[PDB]
């Protein structure tokens, strides 16, 4: 019966906001796109403008090549049949070369070479996007927290696709490009290394993924509960603490016995999120290269009855 | 009668769109059921009559 502030009840539109021109080449920035009332019911209605620099276009074209390579392989697997393509869309897979090729690049296209091509494209796209996040932060004079938070996820991705295959000595260890295919790869990876549940770093990574869900629920709910005091304007609460920040702090102080500040809760948030992929990459790197049976390792380290 | 009062409460536009979706779903379902029964698949029946397959 009361307004929960989940959806805006009255939308307001003014002149298009071009943004802050700190050091941004206004040539690279595109024009403001359309206004989406559907998106405006939940957040901002404005689309664009989007910046397109050197790294932006490099990453966009490299990612387009990766996506197109996978899609053309999928069309080949369908026998160029659109009905088959739609029927088996989730069952298609661009697989890495068989283990007998090792890390060599001399695998046939149908048996792993096209996977290497798509992998190179993806590698370029992701690293150019990382540089792009760093440079976009730099142009506006902001800190580089987004770049390092992205670097954590990039490290999990690199361990999965690049570093662990090299350590294990074959491209066959890497992840195929496919919807159900990479799910099968995940399940098989767990089975081969003996119940990845007993990997300590898989356990910590899950602790932090659960903790990210918990913490974003807590933080979103807290900010919505104090939005009646302008609590969603967190930067001004950092600069000039209002009653929203105090009420949020006191809620969690009286509930848990300790609280955060408007600025430090975001340190909690960023670390809780990055630890997911950081710990996960460590665990995946250890799997196979150091421990090949995590249940037996568990038994030898407590964690499981002998 | 006095049925036009039904337009004094419900938005005409969404009524018409919902009616169109409902009618299309029903017609498609009825035709598909007729196809499912081999004794009313007019393509199959015509193939049997004209010795097509």
């Amino acid at each position: 019966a009361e307004y929960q502030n989940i959806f805006t009840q009255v939308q307001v539109r003014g002149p298009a906001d071009l943004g802050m021109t700190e050091d941004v080449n206004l040539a690279n920035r595109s024009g403001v796109g359309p206004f989406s009332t559907l998106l405006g019911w939940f957040g901002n209605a404005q689309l664009g403008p989007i910046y397109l620099g050197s790294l932006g276009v490099l990453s966009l074209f490299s990612g387009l090549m990766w996506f197109f390579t996978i899609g053309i392989w999928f069309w080949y697997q369908a026998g160029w049949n659109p009905a088959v393509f739609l029927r088996d869309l989730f069952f298609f897979s661009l697989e890495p070369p068989a283990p007998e090729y090792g890390l060599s690049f001399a695998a046939p296209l149908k048996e792993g070479g096209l996977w290497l091509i798509a992998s190179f494209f993806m590698f370029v796209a992701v690293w150019s996007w990382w540089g792009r996040t760093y440079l976009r932060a730099q142009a506006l004079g902001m800190g580089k927290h987004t770049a390092w938070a992205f670097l954590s996820a990039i490290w999990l991705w690199m361990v999965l696709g690049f570093i662990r295959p090299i350590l294990m000595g074959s491209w066959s260890e890497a992840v195929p490009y496919g919807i159900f295919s990479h799910l099968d790869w995940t399940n098989n990876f767990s089975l081969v290394h003996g119940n990845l549940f007993y990997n300590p770093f898989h356990g910590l990574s899950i602790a932090f993924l659960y903790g990210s869900a918990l913490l974003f629920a807590m933080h979103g709910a807290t900010i919505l509960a104090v939005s009646r005091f302008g609590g969603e304007r967190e930067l001004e609460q950092i600069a000039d603490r209002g009653t929203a920040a105090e009420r949020a702090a006191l809620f969690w102080r009286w509930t848990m016995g300790f609280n955060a500040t408007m600025e430090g809760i975001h340190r909690w948030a960023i670390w809780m999120a990055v630890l997911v992929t950081l710990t996960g990459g460590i665990g995946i790197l250890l799997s196979g290269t150091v421990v090949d049976n995590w249940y037996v390792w568990g038994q030898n380290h407590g964690m499981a009855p002998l | 009668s006095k049925f036009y009062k039904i337009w004094m409460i419900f938005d005409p536009r969404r009524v018409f769109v919902a009616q169109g979706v409902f009618l299309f779903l029903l017609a498609v379902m009825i035709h598909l059921i007729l196809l499912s029964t081999p004794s009313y698949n007019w393509l199959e029946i015509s193939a049997a009559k004209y010795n097509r397959v």
Binding site: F7, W41 | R14, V17, A18, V21
Partner: peptide
């Protein structure tokens, strides 16, 4: 949208 939320296409259009 929740007022017309009591398939989804009826509220969608």
């Amino acid at each position: 949208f929740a007022f017309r939320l009591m398939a989804a296409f009826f509220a969608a259009t």
